[PDB]
Every structure is written in C-alpha cells, then in structure tokens.
Design a protein around this ligand. Structure first.
Ligand SMILES: NC(=O)C1=CN([C@@H]2O[C@H](COP(=O)(O)OP(=O)(O)OC[C@H]3O[C@@H](n4cnc5c(N)ncnc54)[C@H](OP(=O)(O)O)[C@@H]3O)[C@@H](O)[C@H]2O)C=CC1
Ligand SMILES: NC(=O)C1=CN([C@@H]2O[C@H](COP(=O)(O)OP(=O)(O)OC[C@H]3O[C@@H](n4cnc5c(N)ncnc54)[C@H](OP(=O)(O)O)[C@@H]3O)[C@@H](O)[C@H]2O)C=CC1
Ligand SMILES: Cc1[nH]c2ncccc2c1[C@@H]1CCN(C(=O)C2(c3ccccn3)CC2)C1
Ligand SMILES: Cc1[nH]c2ncccc2c1[C@@H]1CCN(C(=O)C2(c3ccccn3)CC2)C1
Lengths: 264, 264
C-alpha cells in the first residue's frame, strides 16, 4: 500500500506541469517532500507553480521551459534536471501538444507534430533518463487515455500517439523485466478529466461526466510509486473490466517461450 | 463468400511489393486479372515483378520507385499511380523499414525513421488516395502485426508504429462510417510469415512456426475485398479469439451516444 513518505526526498521530473493534471501532481509531490523539476512552454506559468510548490513543502523546485516538439530540448532538459537534483527517481511523461476534436481531413503536418510531441519526446526523454533511473531502481509514469486503448471519432492523430505509447513502453517494460533491470513503467489510462483544456475542447461535442484532476493526479503518483503496470482512472465502474483484455495478458505470457533465453 | 472474379480488372496499389508478402499479393492480383502499380525502393527488383505479373496475366502492371521516408514521394506516387490506371479500387499499404530483433537502444533519428515509413507514410497515401477511393467506393488494407495488438520484446519501435496504425485507422473507419462514406478499412493482423527477411531475422532468436506467404497474401486480399474491419492470419487458431477484445468493441459502440450528430 502507498505512503507519501515513499516520495519524501525523492527526485521527480514532471513535464506539462504548468497546468491541469500535471500541475496537480507538482503540488501533491511538493506536499510529500519530494524534489521536483518542472517544465512546459510557459515561463510564467512554471514560475507560479514552482513558487506554490515551495510553499507546499517541496525540498526543492526548479522549472526549465521549452517546447517538446524540439527533441534536442527534450533530451538536454533531462540532463539539466538530473544535474539540478543529483539523480532521478521518477520520470512522469504527461505533457501533450494542443489538441482539438475534429474529423480527420488531410493533416500530414498535424499528424507529425502530434506524433513528435505526444510520442517522440517521451521516447527521447525515457532513454536520456534511463541511465539515472537504472541507478535508482526508479519508475516512469506514462500518462495515456481510454483513447489509447479504444478509439473515438474526431481524435485520430492524438489517438495514434497514445496507442504508440502502449506498444513501445509495454515492450520496454517486459525487456527491462527480462534483463533484470528494476525500473517500472506505469501506463496510466484515464477517462475524461475536468482540466480546463479538456472541457473547453469537448464543449458542445462530448457530453460525458468528468472526474476531478486533483484525485486523478493522486492515483497517477500512487500507481507509479507502487510500480504498477497500468493505472485506470475513469468515472464508470465498468471501464477497467471491459478494458481488461485478458487475451493480451495470456499471449504476452506465453510468447516468451518463442525466445532464445541467452538473448536475455 | 469471396470470389476472385471480384478483382478482375480492378485498380490496385501495392507497396513493398518487390519482395516478400508484398510480392505475393501482386502475383495473386495479377492472376485474378487486375491492374496493378507497385512501389518500393528497388528499381530493378520492381522490374522483375512487373515482368512476372504481366506473365501471370495482370490486366496491367506498372511500378514507381522511391523511399516512403519522403512524404512528398508518398503523396505524388498515389497521384501518378491514379493517373496510370485512371482510378483506384484498392490501396495496399504493406512496406516497412529494415527491422531487427534487439532490446531497445535506438537514437531518436532511427525511431523517427521507423514512424515515418511504417506509419506516417500510411496516413499520407490513404489521405491522398481517399478522393479516388470515394470516387470508386474502394478499400484500404493496413498490414499490421500481432505485435500491433500485444507486445513482444526486442521489437518496440516496430510495435509502436503498428499500435499507431490500429489507433489511427480504426478512428478513420469509425469516422467514415458515421458520415456515410463507402470506403472500407481492413487491418490485417499477421503472425510469423516465412518471407526471406523475417526468417533469417528471427534466425537464432525466435523459434516459432511460420505461416506460408502465398496463403497469407490471399487471406489479405480476400478480407479487404469482403470489407472486413480486421483479418487475422497466424498458424495458431486460438489466436483470433484471444485477440478478440470484445470489450473495446462494446465500448467503441456506446461511445457515439455521447456525441452530437451536428458534427456528422
Ligand atoms: N483531461 C482529460 O480528459 C484526459 C487527459 N489525458 C492525458 O493527461 C495528460 C495531461 O492532461 P491535461 O492536464 O488535461 O492537459 P493540459 O492541456 O491542461 O496541459 C498539459 C501541459 O502540456 C503543456 N504543453 C502543451 N504544449 C506543449 C509543448 N508543445 N511542449 C511542452 N509542453 C507543452 C502545457 O503547458 P504549455 O501550453 O504552457 O506549454 C500544459 O502544462 C495528457 O497526456 C493527456 O493526454 C488523457 C485522457 C483524458
Ligand atoms: N514476415 C512476418 O513474419 C510478418 C510481417 N508482417 C507485416 O507484413 C508486411 C510485409 O513484410 P515482409 O514481406 O515480411 O517484409 P519484406 O522485407 O520482405 O518487404 C518489405 C518491403 O518494403 C520495402 N521497403 C522497405 N523500406 C522501404 C521504404 N523506406 N520505402 C518504400 N518501400 C520500402 C521493401 O523493398 P525495398 O527495400 O527495395 O524498398 C520490401 O519490398 C510488413 O508491414 C510487416 O510488418 C506482420 C507480422 C509478421
Ligand atoms: C482533444 C483534447 N485536447 C485536450 N487537451 C488537454 C486534455 C485533454 C484533451 C483532449 C481530449 C478530450 C478528452 N480526451 C480523451 O482522451 C477521452 C475522450 C476522447 C474522445 C471522446 C471521449 N472521451 C476521455 C477519454 C482527451
Ligand atoms: C525482425 C523482423 N524483421 C522483419 N523484416 C520483414 C518482415 C518481418 C520482420 C521482423 C519480425 C519477425 C516477426 N515479426 C512480428 O511482428 C511477429 C513476432 C515478433 C516477435 C516475436 C514473435 N512474433 C509475428 C508477429 C516481425
């Protein structure tokens, strides 16, 4: 079971922390006495949150600002964040590029930039951060969506980038497990959350019930601290079960016999 | 019930058709007596296969050479192809980048390479081809892997692009359907296929039984022609069931009742 002391004095990165879900995780982490380094495009939005974080009890709080469409920034940012803290216990990949609802029509340029920001910068940052994480037996939080397990109309690009997250990190997850690297990867599948940017976007298009961003943030943290493979945070009770996919678990367990053990 | 007569004289595009599964689908379509345009990087390799296709009885056979790493080629190929045949009934997106089995150690450049060719190019051509496919109510086939539904080690970049296909094209399908477009989208979930490449590539790493390439090809063509959401071909029979994932289906279904039709 979870104890906030588990994050006390621990080094934690959070991308997308200037608002929404990722700001809330900044506060919760700050109240648990972790060291945090935060980042986003908005330099002023990052300032206010670090300032709140310090009032909230954070051992230390630093921002670095930029855009995660730039892979150079994505990687160098991890390196500065590990130098400011002297290590890295937890990498939480949360930011996403400006998304809207709409039927797909001819966006090669939209699809790419989405893929880079919502997928590429995650892979960039995971691998840059993995040496420091391997040293601490740390954990990654990869924040995804029901739309990373099932599909909804009007969100083809975004949805491509979340599916890609499962495919990729799930594979990293097993590989780590089989080569005995004690780093955990939590895929955090979430339903509608009442962040300001989600509601504005669904307005007049989707009429679902949203869940609170504060508690959402909480389950993400606790799930990753507890080295869980997946977190499901959604309003409906019949979500983790209809999304269970017991076949995928069965296939993944047996597929290993296909492999030469020496490879591992 | 599938009738090969169905494809006599139809206009088909096949990618990665200079060898492997791609080459088989061209042969088959040719015996059915269809028009084909083939593409891939190999100039002379493409030539042997067109010469062969014409020998088998293809209505027509042409090729356009190039790399699908370049989106400009990807769009413009579909345009030249369309002209060459005067239209399009079936687009087969099949090509993939050089792919090796190994624990993940790629740098971002390589991973972008994987996602551009394996994924981004697929989105590009289906977008470009869509107008003719509407013109003819044709079909799209997206060649995926079991690795696009569940995870296997040593294949995370590949598995990502594959997962990114299910997410994107499943969305497009739903969107085409709620808007009454008569273009169908067939995701083909393949198991190990005894193509030269994969066999020598799994050599010493994976000991599974392969499915025959000639049949695989036909099962692709049959499904896309019958307009199936998904095709499953793999030596094990208990596979399509386990990968059934009825919950996702049940869930994608009720999901529309939370939308406003004014967007239809
Ligand atoms: N709320 C919901 O309904 C659901 C949310 N999720 C996932 O939860 C996570 C966070 O959601 P949420 O808090 O609502 O999102 P928000 O839109 O509220 O904010 C996310 C963060 O991303 C940052 N950001 C935006 N663009 C860039 C960029 N180009 N480079 C770097 N940072 C950027 C934002 O800061 P800034 O603009 O200043 O750069 C912001 O701090 C995302 O991964 C989302 O996909 C998943 C399912 C449902
Ligand atoms: N074989 C198997 O066991 C399985 C295969 N699949 C899927 O089946 C499909 C076909 O695979 P397979 O026939 O076995 O592999 P092959 O290597 O035999 O064929 C791949 C084709 O893609 C072409 N190609 C490679 N790179 C590019 C590029 N950058 N631009 C354009 N064309 C390119 C190749 O030609 P050239 O190099 O000259 O460009 C070749 O014709 C793939 O999508 C794969 O994921 C899925 C599950 C299992
Ligand atoms: C577009 C967009 N921009 C955003 N900026 C910030 C946060 C969320 C979003 C979003 C969508 C809105 C909700 N999102 C979902 O993934 C869920 C969903 C999708 C489609 C239909 C029903 N639900 C809730 C699962 C993410
Ligand atoms: C490496 C490599 N190069 C290739 N060049 C051309 C075609 C396929 C491949 C491939 C692998 C071989 C098998 N592939 C799979 O996607 C499946 C799988 C993966 C892992 C373990 C058991 N099965 C069959 C599903 C793709």
């Amino acid at each position: 079971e979870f104890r906030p002391e588990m994050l006390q004095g621990k080094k934690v990165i959070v991308t997308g922390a200037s608002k929404g879900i990722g700001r809330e995780m900044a506060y919760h982490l700050s109240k648990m006495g972790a060291h945090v380094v935060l980042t986003a495009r908005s330099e002023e939005g990052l300032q206010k949150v670090v300032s709140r974080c310090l009032e909230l009890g954070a051992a230390s709080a630093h921002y670095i600002a930029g855009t995660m469409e730039d892979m150079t920034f994505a990687e160098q940012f991890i390196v500065k964040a590990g130098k400011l803290m002297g290590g890295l216990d937890m990498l939480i990949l949360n930011h996403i590029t400006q998304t809207s609802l709409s039927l797909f029509h001819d966006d090669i340029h939209s699809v790419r930039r989405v893929m880079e920001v919502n997928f590429l910068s995650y892979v960039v940052m995971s691998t840059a951060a993995l040496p420091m994480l391997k040293q601490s037996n740390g954990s990654i939080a990869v924040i995804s969506s029901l739309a990373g397990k099932v599909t909804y109309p009007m969100v083809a690009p975004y949805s491509a980038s979340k599916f890609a997250l499962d495919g990729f990190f799930s594979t990293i997850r097993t590989e780590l497990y089989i080569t005995k690297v004690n780093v955990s990867i939590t895929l955090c599948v979430l339903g509608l959350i009442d962040t300001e940017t989600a509601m504005k976007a669904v307005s007049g298009i989707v009429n679902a019930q949203a869940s609170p961003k504060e508690e959402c943030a909480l389950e993400i943290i606790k799930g990753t601290a507890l080295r869980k493979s997946e977190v499901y945070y959604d309003k409906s009770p019949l979500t983790p079960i209809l999304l269970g996919n017991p076949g995928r678990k069965i296939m993944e367990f047996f597929s290993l016999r296909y492999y030469n053990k020496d490879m591992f």
